[PDB]
């Protein structure tokens, strides 16, 4: 079967401003097969109660999912997305960059 | 005037770990309205947009019945496909199905589509006429022969050109306040020094609906593609979408560059510059 | 409105 590794984007629902409630997003796309595990990390630790969209796919048959959690950014808290998939030898970590 | 109702269904086998899992989602344009997951705690068709929450329990029971029926059907199909390809009983496999009906720019039915993939590869598709099939390989020709003998295309066409369109129009009316109103992108340009001679300009579009958008950079009014990076358009999670396009530029030449934004919610294409 | 169809 096809094996395609996920593209990963880590971002916020609205422009991030310290002290203002928002949502942290990790969008995984372009992957196959569909089983995948995604965690959002705060200062290296798993965030509990993260929600995700329902499994869908693109015209090229590859899958996509959005994982998201409410958060209030601060100057010093660091965020990341950690993705595991059959195509990855080890979970892949992508750090949140506020202008990406 | 153009709108679509689209469904995306996925079944995944897991030999030795139970029977296959079936997930289906439905959209009007870029707005999801329904989901079903056979592995959910209590599998049922469930609303995912406000404009189907008043359809009533009869409607929802009937959708749930159809999802359970298709999950069943996909389980048989997965078993058939394993046989067509002489595949081992141990491997996991995926069956995907996408179909939909599209209104053209004058709001009239324009076309339908119906396509299936096995393990991420095209398997069988209804042709554009909705009366004939394209089989990707000799295994899919087995399916084509069965469906030809069964007049299966006529049944698919009856749904795509009839029921599908009628319900799409009902959803469009019930959700007209959101589904029939484009939201223009909110834009800005950011700047990052790279080195003593290079910088990055990033052109942003946020909060737009529908998802289709074009972002282009120009230098002195000439389209610039060689050194422009474009991320995949991505969901914000609130029903709107985001995208950016970045160009690397010589430090000190930033003012030569303009970003151009095209979107259904803009009355004319938009030109932007970095405003330090 | 969903639609359910024949087996492959
Ligand atoms: Na991307």
Residue numbers in the entry:
A (entry chain B): 0 to 99
B (entry chain A): 1 to 276
C (entry chain C): 1 to 8
Q: What did the paper state?
A:
pmcMHC class I molecules bind peptide antigens and present them to cytotoxic T lymphocytes (CTLs). We herein demonstrate that human leukocyte antigen (HLA)-A∗24:02 and HLA-C∗14:02 proteins, which are known to bind conventional long peptides, also have the potential to bind N-myristoylated short lipopeptides. These HLA class I molecules shared a serine at position 9 (Ser9) with Mamu-B∗098, in contrast to most MHC class I molecules that harbor a larger amino acid residue, such as tyrosine, at this position. Thus, we concluded that the structural flexibility of the large B pocket of HLA-A∗2402 and HLA-C∗1402 primarily accounted for their previously unrecognized capacity to bind such chemically distinct ligands as conventional peptides and N-myristoylated lipopeptides.
We also elucidated the crystal structure of HLA-C∗14:02 complexed with the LYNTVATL (LL8) peptide to address whether B-pocket remodeling may occur in order to capture the P2 amino acid residue, Tyr. We found that the hydroxymethyl side chain of Ser9 switched its spatial orientation and protruded into the B pocket cavity by disconnecting the hydrogen bond with Asp74. Alternatively, the side chain of Ser9 formed a hydrogen bond with the phenolic hydroxyl group of the P2 Tyr residue, allowing its anchoring at the B pocket. This resulted in raising the bottom of the B pocket and increasing the surface hydrophilicity, thereby successfully creating a hydrogen bond with the P2 amino acid residue. Thus, the hinged switch-like movement of the hydroxymethyl group of Ser9 appeared to control peptide and lipopeptide binding.
